[model samples]
Target: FNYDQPYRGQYHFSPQKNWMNDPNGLLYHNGTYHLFFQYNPGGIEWGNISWGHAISEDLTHWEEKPVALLARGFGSDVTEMYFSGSAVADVNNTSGFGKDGKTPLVAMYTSYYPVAQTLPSGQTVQEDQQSQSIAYSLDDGLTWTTYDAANPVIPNPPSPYEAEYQNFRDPFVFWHDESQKWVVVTSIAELHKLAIYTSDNLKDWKLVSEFGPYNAQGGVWECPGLVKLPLDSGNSTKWVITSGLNPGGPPGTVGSGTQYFVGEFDGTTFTPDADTVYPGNSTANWMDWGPDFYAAAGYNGLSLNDHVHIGWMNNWQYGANIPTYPWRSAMAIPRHMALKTIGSKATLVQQPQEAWSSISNKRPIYSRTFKTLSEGSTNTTTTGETFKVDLSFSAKSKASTFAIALRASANFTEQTLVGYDFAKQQIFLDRTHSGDVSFDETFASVYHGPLTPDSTGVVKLSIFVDRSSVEVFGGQGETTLTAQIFPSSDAVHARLASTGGTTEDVRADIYKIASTW
Candidate 1:
């Protein structure tokens, strides 16, 4: 159940048992941090999406809680709810016009009804119909009340943008400071857009503006989160609009990823940079560079000292097929975000927040300097279930491939491999032979680093090895590779190799990270 180390691209984290996706309602209430996600309790596949809740004191460790909300029939006999919205604390009781003293934590989401009918051709057909609903928790997040006004808050109105199939779902509500009003951003398929509605109270809403159909290259834009980050230059602000795309066709073609648009929002419309409205690093910097990162949601709780965001860590294409038991999805490491200017454009770089290191409990494993790599010179050690290593290497030849292999037994070449390839300027993770079985596919990435070169022509790597996952930070956070691996043997060791002439030598410092959980 730990994800500190990297899994072999095929492994994933689902909460013990069941289905999970699109991390939602990422908030800090009272003192505990709550992460609510799209869940189906009946099985480990997508169906009957409801809110599954978990809490963590630190971002590194998490404990699952009971179902936060279940999709029950609200007047009609719809058996299950699908993709409920978000939860926000009603602070002022504004719906009462300042009269009623009731302030509750409201959970808003879309309720889907599937209607099956027999066609004239004698085929039974099922069509999905959806509406928005709310549940109120009066005492923090301990209990709730499903409101009777659970009908669609914003019903699909006949317009040029209306669609019969994908409408009325994924409600994201937050308090707007500029207008002192509550704004709800929900996916409106009829318009092929994300619609914004304003409300003084949680029950009633007024449609404000419809912001896209901007051709984001997906069948539907699912789970939209809008946030404004202060620009680093300290003059203006940039608004970030993020969504998960479920590309309905083709395999291995890069569908089901998260995309964001950055631009200026003048209260009514979002004027996104026209050139930056698509998926890929060329259009928008990826939310995470690693595989299996998607459906990310940020906390709407503005009271927290930092901007906290979480994403579901599984690719929708084959997420369900991963060879894991009980659960089928997991949230990525929590990230603290900010706006930084790389050159002239502003971009967001997500890093593991500092709070994650609070779980460290081990001392340095080994720190040494290898002036030269003789044919038989190597380093080996046995690591516990959880640990981290800090690796530094300097090469005399400008073009040389240096590798640090992991989980090697006395034979050195027979173990799970996680290391860096300096000649190719890439970080490599090889999990094909570490365990008895493999679930997904091979995972690798080119190192994304700043243009500046270190004086020693050396690359430093910080690798975290957890019981089930491995996260390697290369070139000081410019590029990172995260993988999930389950080894067949308990052996945890490392070896360094070089492919070149005698001019190449490697130096390293390996530290064993303590288990934060």
Candidate 2:
């Protein structure tokens, strides 16, 4: 496959060919980072779901491996397919799936049994069923063997919720040190309920608690997860539960989004903080203000302080119709998750995990500083399809908005706008005029995210502009907007402007980022 395709992400993690979605089984062990994802080996559209594998010693560079889990058949003939899940390194041999005293890497995923079949446990599952199952790898994550004898360890949802068999999927597993048990966070998508189960060993699970129907019910919930992080670098830690939704995103998206709840998670139960809950009329706390970020799940085998997550950088509404070839989707850059207090509220802040200095050119391609600028536009010398723009501006009195036009053509016919509106106190991304939006009716639009200016009225934006996407981090990651854009190859210039008043102490530095393929 030629990596030079038009919309191929230069540094983003995408399959060489076919379709991919949801970062699954994110485990970092020894010195390697393992990324397994939902993959369709046979085509570009979503089907024949399986776990495709990749690994990296450094997060920037990736090498794709064989499919870790394979679908038994394609389309209608499909018998078994592995959905989303989590992976853990079992050093104690708890499940006994290890060999030769090797530490086993255990992966627990949702198995979609499309046909009637009798499990090795002597139970027959007639209609379509999605159940929890496990597999293990002894030599790192290069190979795998499913636990077939006692497979579908969790045959169905606990008693009363048994009817939601098809909706039960995406099992996120982790070890709970306090209870000395493996905790599994799985969701019933259609029901919007999260079921917490614990296992003495990885094979069996006992349902302990359920949380749900809380905030963000505009669409079905999928790919739920839990992460523990310290507050403001303090020793006290808080647990955050992250989940993905379709059709219903933050205020300004066409479809798809990710929301998180900051709270406490005991070994078995999860209790969201009072403030984290919406007051019947409000909305969920969005992890991103853009439509592209979804299934933002946490990584395994990382310390609380170093917790990170990666999101699928595409929306379901137009995912199948995106104007890309050979590959259909890409993963957002990994973000380090931190719990911070903003406006006296616990907030989830995510910033890129990679050290930019190592991946970017030593010297910036364009740099400028301004003492003052009256309302007008300033075209910079920067020209590129992939680069990072470190821009800061202090909007003075009477200023209505400040914006930067990225991926713009020389004549300004095609552009994606990243800006801040003072009146609304919001940061926005306008891609309505982005090129080739005809692929989907709702593909082109503008989205806004609420953000407050600092005491000095300064707002900083770290924007990543790639071949087919734009990710903006505002106010040091407090607010983020991730959007996908497809611009003509000639759309590589940049322009900046401030409206309604003068802008003070403005600075813009653009750095060219090297490819990691």
Candidate 3:
């Protein structure tokens, strides 16, 4: 814990060794949160996929287990690997996998098979065939087995224009109380659609409805999910489907980002609401403004009905190529998702999971409000490299810019900047010189989002700084930017500054984080 190992995170979730991507089959069971992910046991690149299992009791610390589900000649020849999926503790013995006194833990995922064949046109074509498959564990998620006979329970139905179906994967399963059945929301290719299927049990499925061709397609929608959020005491519930994109995100994004569609959903179809306007005032809403949060999925709020979510903290464009040794990736801090109104229209909000305080050192280094921050005053009270900072700022004048630099060197040669450009109304996290942007061409770009402050010119911000990653939430989670930063191991200062005219009563608090690995 006292050694300098450049980019390894302190409290964030990372496996002991090798590579990991896309969170798969996240669920709650026996007072513990079970998280599964796409992993390659062989090396730190992205191949030979299997289900990597991990468990967490406080949501901040994790303990890894053996590979839960592997495509070892269990599925069809098309089952080249096991991809992303969802998990549920079938309490009702619905799948009939439970026996004696133990309940069954169910998982639904994609089995992907890459194909290259010579066509009649004398040219070879390459394609990937994906299908929905199921696996269950009789003894808590310690071990798993695919239904080899019933595998590909929901195979990619035939494609009208091709020899086989293309992209039918990432199945999210849930129990539909009204319909008294099981539900699966899987992503499809051709039209960037999410097809909903119903099942009386976990083995069989029936496709009923499809939601499609969004106004924006950053790339093929990858991991999609639907969940209901209770709005008020009237039980007026609204649904938000998590839409994930790759390569092409919002303008200036490094690689990929997750977006949400606020709407109403029956047991079958999703009808996107037409009036929810966020900072961009567009029909589509992004889950986070930064470059790193991708392929995110949340729980059904089963245990306490508290909306909680997690995401893979890397981008597909340059995930595997980052400058790191032994391991390649980590998961973002789990976020609490909620529904709120930002001045005009209804929008979704996100904050850190409250469970972190259970293990966090409650003694904060700076917990008071400051009347003024000199142009470049550095706060030297807390541990600069790994900590959490919560601040609320009020601007005395309009069009003022505020900045905070973390992991700054003594001479200020290296630092990661989280600031706001008031004239542009943009909230950005800049890692251009954070260190090691040379590892990837797009790793050093600046990422930002529309600033959504209150009419009083007051904005609330939450920032988390680990050894290598920095995440910031602006305006009560109305906007977010997350990025991986590699500062010099010797950089140990966090400084705050302002450039424009502003009455600066900025209330602030900084907490040093402890290693929870």
Cα-based RMSD of the predictions, in order? Answer: 5.8, 1.4, 4.4
Q: What's the TM-score of each model vs. the native?
A: 0.79, 0.97, 0.91
Model 3 per-residue lDDT tens digits across residues 423-511: 67787788888877787887888888887667887767789999889999888677878888878777777777676554267777788
lDDT for 158 (candidate 2): 76
lDDT of 2 by residue, 1-517 (tens): 4688898988789999999999999999999999999999999999899999999886778899999998866645888899999999998999988788787999999999888988766767756799888999988999898888888888788778888988888999999999999999999888888998999889878989998878898888899999888888668889999999887888878788999999998788889999899866239899999989998888899998889898999999999989888899999989999988888998888888775676797688888888886688886555688899898877553568888899988877889999888778888899999888898887788899988877777878899988999999988688999999999988988888778886778888889987777
> How displaced is residue 378 in candidate 1, in Å?
4.1
lDDT of 1 by residue, 1-517 (tens): 5433333212222475778888877767666677788888778888767788877666655677788876664344555465757877777765432224656677777766566443232433336766566667766665556665434455453255445434667888888778788887777644447877778887788777777765444456677777787666565667878766664211222345565677776655668876556643233445544455567777877532367767776666567766655566666666666666654667765566535346553456666565665533365666654566776666444335556666666666456565444545555666656553344443222223222124567667767665556666654354545555555455576766655532244556665554433
Residue 315, model 2: Cα distance from true site in angstroms = 0.3
Per-residue error for 416 in candidate 2, Å, reads 0.5
Candidate whose lDDT is highest: 2
Assess candidate 1 and give its TM-score to the true structure.
0.79
Off by over 4 Å in 1: 1-14, 73-78, 95-102, 116-126, 188-193, 212-219, 233-236, 247-255, 278-283, 303-305, 369-378, 391-397, 407-461, 473-481, 497-517
lDDT of 1 at 268: 56
